[PDB]
Amino acid sequence: EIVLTQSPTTMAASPGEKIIITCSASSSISSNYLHWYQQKPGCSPKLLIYRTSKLASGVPARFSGSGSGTSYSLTIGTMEAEDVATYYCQQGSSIYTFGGGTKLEIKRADAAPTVSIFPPSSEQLTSGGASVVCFLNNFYPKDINVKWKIDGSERQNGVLNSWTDQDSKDSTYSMSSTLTLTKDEYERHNSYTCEATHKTSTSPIVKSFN
Amino acid sequence: EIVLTQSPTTMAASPGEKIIITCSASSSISSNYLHWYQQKPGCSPKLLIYRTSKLASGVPARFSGSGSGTSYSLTIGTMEAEDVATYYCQQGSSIYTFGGGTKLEIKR
Amino acid sequence: EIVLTQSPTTMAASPGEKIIITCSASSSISSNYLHWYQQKPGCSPKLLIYRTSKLASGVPARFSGSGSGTSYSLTIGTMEAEDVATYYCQQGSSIYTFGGGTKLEIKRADAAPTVSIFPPSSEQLTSGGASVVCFLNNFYPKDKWKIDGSEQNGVLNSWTDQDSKDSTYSMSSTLTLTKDEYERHNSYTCEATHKSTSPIVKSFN
Amino acid sequence: SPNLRYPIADVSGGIGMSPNYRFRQSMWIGIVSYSGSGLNWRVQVNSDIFIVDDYIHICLPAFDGFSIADGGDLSLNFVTGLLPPLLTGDTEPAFHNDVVTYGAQTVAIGLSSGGTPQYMSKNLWVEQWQDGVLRLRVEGGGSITHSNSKWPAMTVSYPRSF
Amino acid sequence: PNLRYPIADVSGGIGMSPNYRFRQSMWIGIVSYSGSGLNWRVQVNSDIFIVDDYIHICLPAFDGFSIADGGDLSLNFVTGLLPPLLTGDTEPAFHNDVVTYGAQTVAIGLSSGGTPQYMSKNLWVEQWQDGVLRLRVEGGGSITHSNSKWPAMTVSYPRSFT
Amino acid sequence: SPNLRYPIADVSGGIGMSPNYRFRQSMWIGIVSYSGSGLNWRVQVNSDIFIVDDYIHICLPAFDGFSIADGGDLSLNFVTGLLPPLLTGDTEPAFHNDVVTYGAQTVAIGLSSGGTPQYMSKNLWVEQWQDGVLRLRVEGGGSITHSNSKWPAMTVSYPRSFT
Amino acid sequence: EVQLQQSGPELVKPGASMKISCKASGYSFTGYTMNWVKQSHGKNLEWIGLINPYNDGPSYNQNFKGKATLTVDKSSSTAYMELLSLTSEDSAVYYCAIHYYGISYWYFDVWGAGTTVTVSSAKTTAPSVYPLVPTGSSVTLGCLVKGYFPEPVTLTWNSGSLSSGVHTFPALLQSGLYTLSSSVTVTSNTWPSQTITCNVAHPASSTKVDKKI
Amino acid sequence: EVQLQQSGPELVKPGASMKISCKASGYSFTGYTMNWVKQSHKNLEWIGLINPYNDGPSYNQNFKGKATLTVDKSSSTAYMELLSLTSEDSAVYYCAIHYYGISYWYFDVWGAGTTVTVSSAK
Amino acid sequence: EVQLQQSGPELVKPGASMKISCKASGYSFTGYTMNWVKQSHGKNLEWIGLINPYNDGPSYNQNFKGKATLTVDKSSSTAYMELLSLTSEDSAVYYCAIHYYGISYWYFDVWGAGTTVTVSSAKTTAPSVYPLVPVGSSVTLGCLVKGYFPEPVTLTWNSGSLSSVHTFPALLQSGLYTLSSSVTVTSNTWPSQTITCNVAHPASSTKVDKKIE
């Protein structure tokens, strides 16, 4: 019944910044029934704040919660690199409900992606299938869109994209888009260009092979 | 709804006398909702006693209020010539109602 | 409405024992409305405990009250001889009701009864009647006439309560006959049996 | 000692707080009178009195009365009934005979005419203590046609005059 | 020797300060209701009593508008308190902690201009923050209404001293 | 300490009132047991405890139980559950194990069979504390046929024993 | 102390009505309520009704509605209970007990001495006292009273002087006549030299007979 | 101190309509409620109330339609219009506010009064 | 400290039913409430149900009524959730969390490690590794792996020597996962140093021998 809504969905901030995540409820709930959880990558959620502004055992003091009625806010005073996680808000007044999560990122710098296009392997061509893999590494922000063109004609089939999580030390992203085709359809095309659109370059970075 | 009925309607008293004006309510009202007003001739009504026994700012100490339920009374310890005026009791428990007045005169 | 049930109905205990009398209520009642009374033999009920655990003025400190909801109890820490009485629990939460009552009596060493047979008086023989009186006194626990070797009509016997200080019982059986029926026979025997192997007999002629 | 003033007193040969100030137990057997719009009846009650710090608690038990108005008064006569050494003046509030709206609670009274009762949620507060009579205001919640009223146990507490 | 409040000189002796035992004040301010999409304001004149380490906010009956099944009532003490009482004097001993203290049952009459129907709501002190005391009002169900009849309610909690 | 007795204690090098006496915070996690006429159920609650002057406040939150009788009892087991250093004996009232009718209030309990509840105005008071268990009396207001009871947040206060 | 004085024993014929009184003395206030309790043969207590001075109307037990009428004379501070159309089942002991200190939790703290009510058609007959006399170091003396109606009858020994070793036996009723016995035991030397006298008093037939054993 | 300044005396022919003003000065808060009282001949009757947070006027049932209450919050002045004036409406009209007496509803500060005379004569 | 232990990962066929166990340890009292939370793809938390020891009956979310049944073994102090008629939408991570300290205000203060349940109709298939090479100052190399049906797949570069190497998460394509790894090195180092990526799949027990060019 009681829907929780978290803003923002994702968030990028450098250490030292003051992060404020908000939890908005569809009904007015007592502040005793609003709680916050922290879930680090590869880990189970852990209790962060219970009854709105009570810090759980062990959490750093830089965390704090506040709010009443339908408006609640999780606040990190001075962010630390450890605070990279997804934060959930949960209410206990009615049927148990969670907020949907707020993901915390590290800001880094607007790095440009280094494009790498690879032809299909020799062991793959013997099996009857040709897969072309385009690698994009070390870019920020995570928002990147790629378009693959065979002989100047755009293609939308067979493309399989994979996005990795933010780097533990580099604090950057990497995307892999593999275009698989049959050995008879790859022998009928002559030019394949891998075009990448990003916020760093006004013009797309294209890698090609014939 | 609630009617306040004062007795007497008029009265004349020499200074030095103890003056008692009563206010009778048709329904039991909380003592927090019975108030008295003093209106000197040619003047506007002025608040005299609020919440039955509390004296308004600036009223002489000889004025006192009392009562509970349906019976309330305004009492002057020793009347003074200044006290000559018309007094009204007012109720705030339901729709506002005034008392009808009690005119105080000098004894001749 | 609210039925109170006491257990046990009757109780026997030797002094020094701890006596527990429980009062069960059909519905839950606040402890403020459960009270106890003590009625010693021949007296009116007296208030013993009010509001479950408060002692009425004068009662000895060996009395205590306990309980909540539907289960209440009255406890004598060490029983004394003066405690022999009937105790009632009464409830005031709804319509007033009393408990069935628990009668307390003192256990004592079994004492053989002292038998005493008495012939009809000289005043009664002139009145046209004849009554034979046989007294069985000071026997514990609480539990026949033979005339000329044969054993009835006209027997009336009274059972007395436990002795206040002696803690025994007594029984009087008065066999009433007519003056014409009396002296037709000679020997009147009064046999009393008790938990002695042979009945104690006292006869006269 | 000539240097200590109640409630500060000698506690086991030391400066401490008097246990009489911390807790005192008493009792009241007297008349509770109801005054409504044209309605008047009296009930006798036995209430426990607790005096804790600068508060007094009158623990009234459940009592049964008669018709009540939508707006009325409950009066406790402390001129008699207090178990010695507690005196009438000990029930005077710290605000003396002032008219107040103190300790306002919701009390549920069962109104009936001999049949199944219907419970009305009335508003009760301490209003005034004058000449040994503590007056409670009972109003609100509406009413029905009734001849008997079932009053719950109600605890009436207020600051005590020192 | 040296005395620390509430221990003070009483008629040349170590005693308890009468200001600690009883203190009377007043509040004239805004009581704001916040429900699920519902907001309204009322002006009230409340009596304030400070007894020992407690503060009593004696709110009189007030009339408001629509209320949600679950909502809050807020008292703004930043302004309105009669001097020398200050806003910080209303801070509880648990400061700005979220609590469920003094939970009582309050009967509010809901109506659409006609005869009200009284709902038994659950009220407790939840939080005091920056001079605003928030009371939670929830439970008891609801009906379609445009006006709410609030009873006189006394709100008490421990008062901060450090 | 030699010439001062709690709550009178040294306050910043002066005779004053102990801050522990003025305000103390604790917690209780334990069983709330209901006993009515043939009805018994248990609920686990986490309550805030406040000790102010010579009073103790048990701030029970809203809990949900099952059928209740017209007359019944609510029992709080303080033999376990108190957060240290608060002990079971710290909850003993100033009237000890006396039977009382203290703090009598009106509590509205919502009775239901899984549907919309109907709220009954019952009468609650502190009656007795014995062996660490505080017994609250709940009676009056009538009843309906129900299988579940919705209990409101209730604050239970009484004087605290100091001897 | 506050005491309750009840009226004496009453013998009523079936179908008639009798009224019992209860006079309260020594009370500090007037707000106490009066009750009536019936203890039948078998020591079963039943609450009959109460009268509250401020209630102005008596409250009755439904089982006693129409059987008992409770009234009060406040000027004399006496309470009355009228039992109408008496039966054998009405033959019991009726106590008056007041709610004095128990005015709110309903415990009867002050009880009356009791009024024992007998319902029978039999006529009032005077008692006939017969002294009984009869070795050992102890002698037992007997006093027999037979053929009286109704109860009670008080038996005293030497005008109430000797109480040790005295066993007064309860009356067993043979329709229209009670039968009571008493046994006194004294040392063998005490009895012959020093006379022992049995005194029987019947307050219903106005007959008191003193018999010397 | 809070004061109330009312309009001067108004002369209106029967059947017409008059509008009276009441201006508040020196107040510390804005939550005071404006009232209007009629003293005919010298019986006092309460006409209506204006509350800044109610967003609407409360009237006495007797004066429903005979008076309409309005307020100009920018100028902090209250208005009362009387419709279809008759001979019995000739009286002194006071404005009073609930300032210190907001919750127990006593009028603690009064206006000077506006005496209204209704007559057909020229 | 109170700890919570869940059962291992499960791979179930569509339409079957799986059972998960949750074991509680180091608890000071017994009145804690067992809950179950499902986190799907997209990290969305949905509470399934709770079990109270004193309620004697489980409480379910309406969306999970009929899909899951919760049970308790009080002797072993372990909780059990059974998911019936599993579908592809039911593939998620299932946590158990208890109201240990959060019994009154309903916050989960103790969480388990989680149990990942995978629903697929495909069988265990061995992966195929395709090395990719390009034909400046730094060169990039690639290792492709496609065709394995059970996860996980582990890929190392030069027997785990060089780690400074981006491995992208698996992608589901027609019941087959495809993972890609990208290692970049200096342009002088690749022609000299031999770079070989090795991938071993435990579920298929297949070791691949892959070199570069």
How many distinct helices of chain G?
1
CATH-wise, what's the superfamily of the largest domain in chain G? Immunoglobulins
Specify the oligomeric state.
heterononamer
Q: How many E strands of chain A? A: 19
Shape of chain A: elongated
CATH class of the largest domain in chain A: Mainly Beta
Helix- and strand-based class of chain G?
A: mainly beta
Instruction: Give the overall form of chain G.
Output: elongated
Element order of chain G: H for helix, E for strand: EEEEEEEEEEEEEEEEHEE
Report helical residue fraction of chain A: under 10%
CATH third-level topology of the largest domain in chain A = Immunoglobulin-like
The CATH topology annotation of the largest domain in chain G reads as Immunoglobulin-like
Helix content of chain G: under 10%
Radius of gyration of chain G: 21 Å
CATH evolutionary superfamily of the largest domain in chain A: Immunoglobulins
Give me the CATH architecture of the largest domain in chain G, please: Sandwich
**Strand element count of chain G:** 18
* Residue fraction in strands of chain G: over 45%
Distance between the first and last residues' Cα of chain A = 58 Å
PDB class: immune system
Keywords: reovirus sigma1, virus antibody complex, neutralization, viral protein, immune system
Assembly: nonameric
Entry title: T3D reovirus sigma1 complexed with 9BG5 Fab fragments
Q: Explain this structure to me?
A:
Chain F: Residues 1-159 form the Outer capsid protein sigma-1 C-terminal domain. Chain F: It is found in: Virion. Chain F: It comes from Reovirus sp. Chain F: This is Viral attachment protein sigma 1. The complex is a heterononamer, with 3 copies of chain A, 3 copies of chain D and 3 copies of chain G. Chain A has helices spanning 122-126, 183-186, and strands spanning 4-7, 10-12, 19-25, 34-39, 46-50, 54-55, 63-68, 71-76, 86-91, 97-98, 102-105, 114-118, 129-139, 145-150, 153-155, 159-163, 173-182, 192-197, 205-209. The longest helix of chain A is centred in the middle third of the chain and has 5 residues, at 122-126. The termini of chain A are far apart. Helices cover 4% and strands 49% of the residues of chain A. Chain A has 2 domains: 1-108, Immunoglobulin-like; 109-210, Immunoglobulins (Immunoglobulin-like). Chain D is mainly β and 162 residues long. Chain D is 2% helix and 55% strand. Chain D is built from 1 helix and 12 strands. The two termini of chain D are 20 Å apart. With 213 residues, chain G is mostly beta strands. Chain G has 1 helix and 18 strands. The radius of gyration of chain G is 21 Å and the shape is elongated. In chain G, 39% of the residues are buried. The chains are: A mainly beta (210), D mainly beta (162), G mainly beta (213).
